[PDB]
Design a protein around this ligand. Structure first.
Ligand SMILES: Nc1nc2c(ncn2[C@@H]2O[C@H](COP(=O)(O)OP(=O)(O)OP(=O)(O)O)[C@@H](O)[C@H]2O)c(=O)[nH]1
Ligand SMILES: Nc1nc2c(ncn2[C@@H]2O[C@H](COP(=O)(O)OP(=O)(O)OP(=O)(O)O)[C@@H](O)[C@H]2O)c(=O)[nH]1
Ligand SMILES: [Mg+2]
Ligand SMILES: [Mg+2]
Lengths: 156, 107, 440, 36, 440
């Protein structure tokens, strides 16, 4: 993390083994690239406009398109690792509860978004609006997929 | 004009330039004038041309030939690693009057 | 850990610095590209480089040095050499005209053309330094800018930086062998600034080093590179405690007050003890006593002046490697009880011992076999006065006939300064014979 | 200690081996110049 | 919704215009077709483009500029260049018969025939605006369609648009190099047009940047294209708070209430700090302390003036890039200790800061390297009066015997105007030494 910004608590890889991506509870959205011969990494901070947020979960698409964030504000941030820029913000109105603590991007263009209350929501990309809602007890901390994704197991 | 019998007929380990068997107007940005084309040794590859020889011709390239043949693995144990400047001073969080928050597993 | 820059002036000073910075970057781990293969995260960050290196962010470690020579041949070979990415181009300041083995066009005529650029570049290093201890200035007393331009630096660095421990690593010319003809002139006309704003003037002549390389190191026909590798290991005990840990850590300000008794007397010697080659390195055991004894011996010294016909007054003994303190103080005891090695009455104490924990790293291609227990001695004796006296005889002979003067005065220098440097040397020689009488 | 001191001889051998390999050709060189 | 209109008048202004509009398009993501592709769009809109461009429905961003010069050759190069589909076809006002170097041609003959056309397109551009905050002007201070033609605009914009900040970015004649023989003459005749009908005037020489890209960028033997890009980076730093996000955004009227002390003392200086080259960029740390110090050195001023021959009255430090606001206050504290920057009796504080959060953008094929940290220092000093006085001396010599006057009084004016323009210069100087006196 930079010296102006804060500290990072998340990591993820991609569909090529040179990208490594971190978010933060202080906004350090940085898409690194791996440089084995010189044994160093090269970061690139992602511009998101003036949307400084606090985010605690990362998931990426199966075809390495876009990485997805779940912020404390209750906002799904989708950004590009190939142009280092934002693509789409979350729910305009009716935002989520205590911040999205678990995101799991499916093989489709969809995403199983959780909450700090247990509002597991399957939503699509452009509106981030709920399609099927079921309330879980406890704040959602883990959304796994049984491979193909027909039986996803949620931990709280 | 020396036609330079191949390889082992020079003090420099080289066959020599083949040479030229129009002069484009070029306003380039690295050298003072146009008639001193090798003023600051731009285009001179004297280090790379000295790395193909066994023994270099200048008596100043001997500093740093066998550097890629290390004789000793370095014992990096008795160092002077700074700990008072790096374990006392935090960067920025003000954590002391912050809540434990998300993921505060304690020993 | 603190910082110290190194201002190399002269063909000699930058070729000594060629062997020095080769050893420097090997000790820490900086490759000739200028990058460390391990990062500061991996290693529990080891800021041992900070004394001679400075990070830029991409891992590009930087020699805290300024190479200067007024003639462009010996500086362009380090902008085209293997260490061309390591240095900075603004650090490598060079000029057009030679000093031509002449003091006058080093200090007055040609030296003024680049005194502005170097003093700006000393400021660039000094600003980003936070604990700048000393100026480690490398030069030779027997040439041009190494006799010239360094004198204009010594005056300017004292007015600008004041008390910042202006050390000086220097090459004296030899009793018999000499590579110049005008060498006596520019070796006593520049020692004005040496007995002026310079606090510890380390001394080496070329001749003694050849004898060490022949006898101990067992190479005939030695070149100037092996002579400079010895100087690099001399620094690497002087700046070892600033870079590596030890039992008795010894700072660069410690050196002065432990070696200069009087403000005029500030000229030490240098001696590296376990300097033997590899074939005769299986042979000797080399524990602690034979190397404490080694620096104290005539045919291991680095300056052609015998300590037996003189009296020691201060001797800091710096140790590296696997040195155990009991082995030192027994070796201290056994050599303080020898008649030929004489200590003056106003130094009942003896030695300043410095123990370090880092064994010396060997240069690949270097002569010096690895030793797990090394000594670099910095003595201070009255016996250096015969080294000043042999060039005094040589200067007085070729000045009484006024030979080789029209090159000097006709280049921006007054005749009167020649007589001033004459009386100045008489004063220092009178001081050294004065400080070594036993008052009783 | 015995390890890289053993290596140190082999480097010193290789320096002198190739320095000899350098000087043998210069003998062969100054010959061919004289041969013409 | 914070717009600025750039009025590039004369040869140099369009030449600076082709370098600045190259830079502006990169920053806001505008292709030479005037279009912004979807990939380089922050999600949704960005709003950081309307300060210098304007959307026209279909997806075409057009510059908010007016290019006028009284001859076709330079403007026709813009119409037949890569940016033919960027600039709108009507905002490239041309006319024929160049004002061959003559202030009279600007303010008598070929100036009044075109001045109604240019102010209409300024009126159309400033009617599309919501938050017009200034008039950026790029003229030449030496020529006919430079100092002469902009003398009509500022004396007609001031009566029409009233209270607006008229910022000038112009090229002043250098101390020893000058293209035309009429250059010193046509620089004091436009002082009745920049002292009252203006707000600020960013002086830029020619000889200075020639030395900037000789000692930092190492681009000896340069041309105008290189110089106009570095001037283009200056504007992009001054007008950066109006578009991007940061910690202390210094708006244009924020800027001038802190820069301009007295109503007639409004001629500041300019420096860009990271003017480092490409290979020397990796070979530097480029932290805030030394870039702020690199603004105050007397060799990086964009106008050939010694700043140590006068007194810094007001200062402002517009940092661009990743700058934490602690180390600026540390950098300010250092320059409050150094004696050589003497400020004034009447301003204890004397420092404004601006912390933007966007790194500088490099021209793809340019000279300035990827630095993630910049600052542009704009200083109102009493030391610019000697640049005024040096061209006064070149005037009085060529004035005294009446020469090159018949070309100038011939195409319509009076002989008297020389003296009052000279008296205005003498009154301009008289304030500058007056303000820089300590008061009791
Ligand atoms: N220690 C050491 N001393 C050297 C070396 N080479 C030369 N010297 C000494 O340096 C003296 C001359 O070198 P310099 O003082 O550097 O001469 P210079 O600076 O090139 O003088 P100009 O060419 O006139 O500018 C000689 O008398 C030698 O004693 C070296 O490689 N190592
Ligand atoms: N830095 C820089 N200076 C320029 C450039 N073009 C002109 N200048 C300077 O500006 C001075 C004035 O010349 P012009 O730009 O032609 O001024 P002008 O009013 O357009 O002259 P005319 O077209 O004859 O009326 C010249 O002496 C140059 O020194 C440029 O592209 N870059
Ligand atoms: Mg030389
Ligand atoms: Mg023109």
């Amino acid at each position: 993390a930079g010296l102006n910004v804060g500290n990072a608590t998340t990591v993820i890889f991609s569909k090529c083994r040179d990208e490594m991506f971190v978010t933060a509870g202080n906004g350090t959205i940085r898409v690194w690239e791996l440089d084995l011969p010189n044994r160093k990494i090269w970061p690139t901070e992602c511009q998101t406009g003036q949307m400084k947020r606090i985010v605690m979960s990362i998931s990426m698409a199966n075809d390495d398109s876009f990485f997805y964030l779940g912020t404390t504000t209750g906002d799904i941030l989708k950004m590009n690792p190939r142009t280092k820029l934002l693509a789409d913000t979350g729910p305009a109105k009716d935002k989520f509860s205590l911040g999205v603590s678990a995101i799991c991007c499916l093989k489709m263009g969809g995403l199983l978004v959780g909450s700090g209350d247990g509002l597991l929501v399957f939503c699509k990309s452009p509106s981030y609006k709920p399609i099927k809602k079921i309330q879980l007890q406890g704040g959602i901390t883990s959304i796994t997929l049984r491979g193909e994704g027909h039986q996803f197991f949620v931990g709280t | 004009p020396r036609r330079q019998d191949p390889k082992e007929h020079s003090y420099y380990y080289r066959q020599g330039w083949t040479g030229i068997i129009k002069r484009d107007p070029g306003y380039n940005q690295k050298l003072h004038r146009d008639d001193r084309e090798h003023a600051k040794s731009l285009g001179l590859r004297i280090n790379e041309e000295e790395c193909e020889r066994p023994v270099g011709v200048l008596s100043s390239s001997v500093y740093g030939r066998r550097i890629d043949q290390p004789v000793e693995p370095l014992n990096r144990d008795h160092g002077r690693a700074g700990h008072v400047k790096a374990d006392f001073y935090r960067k920025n969080d003000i954590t002391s009057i912050k809540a434990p928050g998300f993921g505060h597993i304690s020993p | 850990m603190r910082e110290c820059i190194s201002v190399h002036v002269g063909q000699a000073g930058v070729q000594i610095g060629n062997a020095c910075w080769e050893l420097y970057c090997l000790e820490h781990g900086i490759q000739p590209d200028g990058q460390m293969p391990s990062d500061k995260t991996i290693g529990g960050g080891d800021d041992s480089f900070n004394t001679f290196f400075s990070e830029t962010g991409a891992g590009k470690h930087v020699p805290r040095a300024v190479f200067v020579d007024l003639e462009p041949t010996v500086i362009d070979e380090v902008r085209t050499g293997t260490y061309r990415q390591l240095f900075h181009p603004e650090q490598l300041i060079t000029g057009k005209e030679d000093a031509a083995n002449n003091y006058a066009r080093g200090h007055y005529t040609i030296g003024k053309e680049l005194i502005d650029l170097v003093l700006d570049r000393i400021r660039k290093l000094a600003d980003q330094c936070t604990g700048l201890q000393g100026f480690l200035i490398f030069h030779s007393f027997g040439g041009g800018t190494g006799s010239g331009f360094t004198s204009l630096l010594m005056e300017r660095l004292s007015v600008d930086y004041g008390k910042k421990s202006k050390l000086e690593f220097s090459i004296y010319p030899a009793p018999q062998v000499s590579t110049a003809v005008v060498e006596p002139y520019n070796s006593i006309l520049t020692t004005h600034t040496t007995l002026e704003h310079s606090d510890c003037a380390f001394m080496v002549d070329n001749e003694a080093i050849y004898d060490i390389c022949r006898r101990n190191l067992d190479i005939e026909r030695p070149t100037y590179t092996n002579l400079n590798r010895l100087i690099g290991q001399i620094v690497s005990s002087i700046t070892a405690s600033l870079r590596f840990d030890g039992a008795l850590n010894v700072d660069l300000t410690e050196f002065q007050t432990n070696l200069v008794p009087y403000p005029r007397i500030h000229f030490p010697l240098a001696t590296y003890a376990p300097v033997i080659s590899a074939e005769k390195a299986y042979h000797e055991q080399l524990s602690v006593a034979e190397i404490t004894n080694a620096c104290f011996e005539p045919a291991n010294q680095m300056v052609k002046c015998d300590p037996r016909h003189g009296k020691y007054m201060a001797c800091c003994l710096l140790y590296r490697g696997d040195v155990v303190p009991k082995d030192v103080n027994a070796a201290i005891a056994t050599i303080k009880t020898k008649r030929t090695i004489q200590f003056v009455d106003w130094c009942p104490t003896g030695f300043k011992v410095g123990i370090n924990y880092q064994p010396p790293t060997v240069v690949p291609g270097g002569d010096l076999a690895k030793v797990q227990r090394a000594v670099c001695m910095l003595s201070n004796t009255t016996a250096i006065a015969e080294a000043w006296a042999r060039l005094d005889h040589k200067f007085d002979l070729m000045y009484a006939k006024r030979a080789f003067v029209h090159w000097y005065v006709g280049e921006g220098m007054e005749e009167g300064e020649f007589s001033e440097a004459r009386e100045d040397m008489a004063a220092l020689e009178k001081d050294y014979e004065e400080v070594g009488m036993d008052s009783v | 200690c015995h390890a890289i001191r053993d290596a140190q001889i082999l480097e010193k051998q290789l320096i002198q081996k190739e320095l000899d390999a350098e000087e043998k050709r210069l003998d062969q060189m100054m010959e061919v110049e004289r041969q013409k």
